[PDB]
Ligand binder design. Structure first.
Ligand code: TRC
Ligand code: SF4
Length: 754
């Protein structure tokens, strides 16, 4: 470039390329002859061949070059084990590993971490030395949660970042296009080969007005989530625009983008503006803010760019919301959730109140919660509900501890957890309830699908802002309304809660903390990575079978799934995180949470030759060692949720060939294709009704598998009738080669020596 500004402090030699962004935007701009949205500018500004790339929203697969890769320790293991199989020497773009997903909440900060490190020394150590070996930066356990370390250190306007986590859109709060992927997408960028992405549509949400009172940034995506729903954002990027943008802070902007993962959006982004400039300078990146100020026409939407749908939200009419209890999109004003709870049969007294995580743990957030705590304490009140605080990073723990917020929150009775996901992915030894107990918990997180936080199917979880969680945790009931209601203080007087006031960023600078990162040594030409051969924690990958050149006749249906089938139903979290680097060990959780349309139950499918009902994993393995290839049949938005590539490897390992659904979620469908399976959707969703557990399917036409050509499937019913349906797919000729080779990885390897 002519400028020479580093990407971050951890890669001083790797410089931001806005000259390249601008050359490619301008190449593109002139083929297209129209105004581009901001996400078109950053996405198309990162094409590997802008002159030849065919660009059609919701139609072409864009071939991109991401700037940096970020991995999280529950998905970095499989990501690094597949990278280890590419055979490549070192990674090709800046990459980092963050250790946040294997630390369980039990006693508090310090104690839960010493136990995580003892318990997990094998995995942490594989990650650290594979880091030292292949050049990936390593954030040491307890250092923070990946989306917070990224926003505070690695995100900047104009970055195209990919992370092995669904909540990676968090970065859009700093004007970057940060998309979540499975580990095999991460090894493509890391291997140096172009990454593909189906050209997104752009939903535009225009923000008008200013935020007030109890209303936070969190509210804007709770309202939008309710407006679009879980199915609403699939295939698009939500771009936020309007006067109202400058009324939100950078970390508030990151809250909104972060929760956009729950409506199925490819990512979410906000335009470079002064709030982001400010945060850049307060997080030690004044120079990124200054460089960006000179490339500002490339970091805002063009005038009159076109959104395929526009949603208009008035921040000034907006008022506090609590979403749930079993999806992020049943939206409620905080004002009404009391009544709905009693009309509906929802536990009214709030059991545990949880604030924090990477969605709501900025200094601003911690401060507004403390500004509510400070008033209850000022009337000798304390938390009527159990209360936990999770800092998203060591830097946020260190700075809020120092500016006093952390003690305020201990004084109303909160317990500060380790700077790790903890109860947000379900990594929580909860004890106040009995299992099966019916109870209500309120968090400031994002996802509140079933059993996500404690695996108690009957726990009713609502998500809202940290300030409303504190206010409702002192109250101990969903019946309470902060805005309106009075509290009886220790002294017998009533008073009400003042809407919090708080500094957006520290008056002072931010305390980084001690000893959070391990640099890769460009030194250790002799760094060695060893997976002990008999480890129950880690296992080297073994190449999947290449395709047989034949059609898939007489496939047995392992399970026909009724309803919602999220990646937590396919590959559960909680206790299976322990085996996230061991494929034949986590495979014993294949589809145990899914509902079998035959008997309305989970984990009891009927074995075809023994005619006895039992676990799905077992039955699949049965089929496998008997030579039975099988298929999974699903309903809408299959593979919905978390990025877990183990939802695609695990059917591949137990002998699955195809998953035929009415619709797939984005990240799950890339992962099926990457692992050599067939993701197929019905060309008519009414055909899901022609297929029964007992039918055998033949998928025909693999021989002349073509982009756009649909596949013909013959349904063979027990009485000798058969039916023929058509099945569509989104395989381009790049993905058909992954199919052929048996996985994308087997293909990757054919491009060297075969
Ligand atoms: O149906 C598809 O082709 C994929 C989906 C999600 C995506 O990859 O963006 C879509 O195009 O809507
Ligand atoms: S599990 Fe929760 S805290 Fe962790 S990265 Fe995901 S949204 Fe953030």
């Amino acid at each position: 470039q002519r400028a020479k500004v580093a990407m971050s402090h951890f890669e001083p030699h790797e410089y931001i390329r806005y000259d390249l962004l601008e050359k490619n935007i301008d190449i593109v701009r002139k083929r297209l002859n129209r105004p581009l949205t901001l996400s078109e500018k950053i996405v198309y500004g990162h094409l590997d061949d802008p002159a030849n790339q065919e660009i059609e929203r919701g139609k072409t697969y864009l071939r991109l070059r991401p700037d940096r890769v970020a991995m999280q320790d529950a998905t970095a293991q499989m990501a690094m084990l597949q990278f280890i199989s590419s055979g490549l020497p070192k990674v090709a773009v800046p990459s980092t590993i963050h250790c946040d997903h294997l630390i369980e909440a039990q006693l508090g900060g310090e104690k839960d971490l010493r136990r995580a490190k003892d318990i997990n020394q094998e995995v942490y150590n594989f990650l650290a030395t594979a880091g030292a070996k292949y050049g990936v930066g390593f954030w040491r356990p307890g250092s923070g949660i990946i989306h917070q370390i990224i926003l505070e250190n690695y995100a900047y306007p104009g970055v195209l970042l990919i992370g092995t986590d669904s909540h990676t859109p968090n970065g859009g709060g700093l004007g970057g296009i940060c998309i979540g992927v499975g580990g095999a997408d991460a090894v493509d960028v890391m291997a140096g080969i172009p990454w593909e992405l189906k050209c997104p549509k752009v939903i535009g949400v225009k923000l008008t007005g200013s935020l007030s009172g109890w209303t936070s940034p969190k509210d804007v995506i709770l309202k939008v989530a309710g407006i679009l729903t879980v199915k609403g954002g699939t295939g698009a990027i939500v771009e936020y625009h309007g006067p109202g943008v400058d009324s939100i802070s950078c970390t508030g902007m990151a809250t909104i983008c972060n929760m956009g993962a729950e409506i199925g959006a490819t990512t979410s982004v906000f335009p470079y503006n002064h709030r982001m400039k400010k945060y850049l300078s307060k997080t030690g990146r004044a120079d990124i803010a200054n460089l960006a100020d000179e490339f500002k026409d490339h970091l805002v939407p063009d005038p009159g760019c076109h959104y395929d749908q526009v949603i208009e939200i008035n921040l000034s009419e907006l008022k506090p919301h609590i979403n749930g209890p079993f999806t992020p999109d049943l939206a409620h004003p905080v004002a009404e959730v009391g009544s709905v709870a009693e009309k509906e049969g929802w536990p009214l007294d709030i059991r545990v109140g949880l604030i924090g995580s990477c969605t709501n743990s900025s200094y601003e957030d911690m401060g507004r919660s403390a500004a509510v705590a400070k008033q209850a304490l000022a009337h000798g009140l304390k938390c009527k509900s159990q209360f936990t605080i999770t800092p998203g990073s060591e830097q946020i723990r260190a700075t809020i501890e120092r500016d006093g917020y952390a003690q305020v929150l201990r004084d109303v009775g909160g317990i500060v957890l380790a700077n790790a996901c903890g109860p947000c992915i379900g990594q929580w030894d909860r004890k106040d309830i009995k299992k099966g107990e019916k109870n209500t918990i309120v968090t400031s997180y994002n996802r509140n699908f079933t059993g996500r936080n404690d695996a108690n199917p009957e726990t009713h979880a609502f998500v809202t802002s940290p300030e409303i969680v504190t206010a409702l945790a002192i109250a101990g009931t969903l019946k309470f309304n902060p805005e309106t209601d009075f509290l009886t203080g220790k002294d017998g007087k009533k008073f009400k809660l003042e809407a919090p006031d708080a500094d957006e960023l520290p008056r002072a600078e931010f305390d980084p903390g001690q000893d959070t990162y391990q640099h890769p040594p460009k030194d250790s030409s002799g760094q060695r990575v060893d997976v002990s051969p008999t480890s129950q924690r880690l296992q080297l990958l073994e190449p999947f079978d290449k395709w047989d050149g034949k059609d898939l006749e007489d496939l047995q249906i392992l399970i026909k799934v009724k309803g919602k089938c999220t990646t937590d139903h396919i590959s559960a979290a909680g206790p299976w995180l322990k085996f996230r680097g061991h494929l034949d060990n986590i495979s014993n959780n294949l589809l145990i949470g899914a509902i079998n349309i035959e008997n309305r139950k989970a984990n009891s499918v009927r074995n075809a030759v023994t005619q006895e009902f039992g676990p799905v994993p077992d039955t699949a393995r049965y089929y496998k060692q008997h030579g039975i290839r099988w298929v999974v049949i699903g309903d809408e938005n299959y593979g919905e949720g978390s990025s877990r590539e183990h939802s695609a490897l695990e059917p591949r390992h137990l002998g699955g060939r195809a998953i035929i659904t009415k619709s797939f979620a984005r990240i799950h469908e890339t992962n099926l294709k990457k692992q050599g399976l067939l993701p197929l959707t019905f060309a008519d969703p009414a055909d899901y009704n022609k297929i029964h557990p007992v039918d055998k399917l033949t998928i025909q036409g693999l021989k002349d598998f073509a982009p756009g050509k649909p596949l013909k499937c013959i349904i063979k019913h027990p009485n000798g009738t058969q039916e023929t349906i058509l099945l569509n797919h989104t395989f381009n000729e790049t993905q058909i080669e992954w199919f052929r080779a048996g996985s994308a990885l087997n293909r990757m390897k054919e491009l060297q020596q075969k």
